[PDB]
Amino acid sequence: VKGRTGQRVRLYVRGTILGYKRSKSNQYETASLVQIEGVNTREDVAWYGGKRMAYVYKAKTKSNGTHYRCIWGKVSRPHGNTGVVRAKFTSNLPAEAMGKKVRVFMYPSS
């Protein structure tokens, strides 16, 4: 903790991928569901509505010198009364992504 190695500033709030917008017997892979760490209510996700996020994973082959990958997306609208958001990405996430971390920056700010 003290004298640690890693990123020295976090300008992004963590979030967990939580699934897809799904009915009881359908999935709509176009939009994913995201839980932002620290947001608990429907009004507060109205602030993040717009602030883009990044799914950062890492593949097996090295391309452009790195295994790390990034898929880009943003918080479209709230999803429910408990601070869950719908996230729209450039290309739909893998189903394996649910449960993993996602970075939610503040770029399109105000």
Partner: protein
């Protein structure tokens, strides 16, 4: 009052007043001038097979991008993206193309005067007095790239030859940084602790909710 502005703009009489048909009733008699048949080129080098279309001079005149209300010349901003993410800088003035123009100052942050998009900055409630700084010398051409030719591929032999040479930002930008940095440090020492503040970088330590955080 966007609607009231729209009505006042849309009124026929005020459309006359804006388009200034008067003082066109000045030059060309007391009647509106005629137009003619320009463009007598009569020299087409080549006849395209498909129906001919010429290039557009965009006659549309976009509104300049508006600045945030909470941004005033003299604010301390928070960078968000790029290599300077988290750096706390000073907003000097909005340059003419629509982007913010900021300074570190370069002595303390290492962020020079640089152009940053308004999207990727956050206003802070702090203000500095920069009445005494000269900025008019700054413009878009100051930053216009004039990117060189794509025949240079950066190889291993150039990787550190560029680093061990100084064929980089030319000396007048160096000189410029000195004057702005001095003329703004003199006013930064007036506010206590602000030198340390700008030296710091903004980090979102655990249990910090941005929407809860004021700025």
């Amino acid at each position: 009052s966007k609607m009231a502005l729209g009505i006042k703009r849309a009124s026929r009489s005020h459309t006359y007043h804006r388009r200034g048909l008067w003082a066109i009733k000045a030059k060309h008699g007391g009647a509106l001038p005629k137009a003619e048949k320009p463009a007598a080129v009569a020299e087409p080098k080549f006849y395209p097979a498909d129906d001919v279309k010429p290039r557009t001079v965009s006659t549309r005149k976009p509104h300049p991008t508006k600045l945030r209300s909470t941004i005033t010349p003299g604010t301390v901003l928070i960078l968000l993206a790029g290599r300077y993410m988290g750096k706390r800088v000073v907003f000097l003035k909005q340059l003419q193309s629509g982007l913010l123009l900021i300074t570190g100052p370069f002595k303390i942050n290492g962020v020079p005067i640089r152009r940053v998009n308004q999207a990727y900055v956050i206003a802070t409630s702090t203000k500095v007095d920069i009445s005494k700084v000269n900025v008019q010398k700054f413009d878009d051409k100051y930053f216009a790239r004039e990117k060189k030719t794509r025949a240079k591929k950066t190889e291993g032999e150039l990787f550190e030859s560029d680093k061990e040479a100084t064929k980089n930002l030319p000396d007048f930008k160096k000189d410029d940084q000195k004057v702005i940095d001095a003329e703004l440090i003199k006013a930064i020492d007036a506010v206590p602790d602000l030198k340390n503040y700008l030296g710091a970088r903004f980090s979102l330590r655990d249990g910090d909710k941005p929407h809860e955080m004021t700025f």
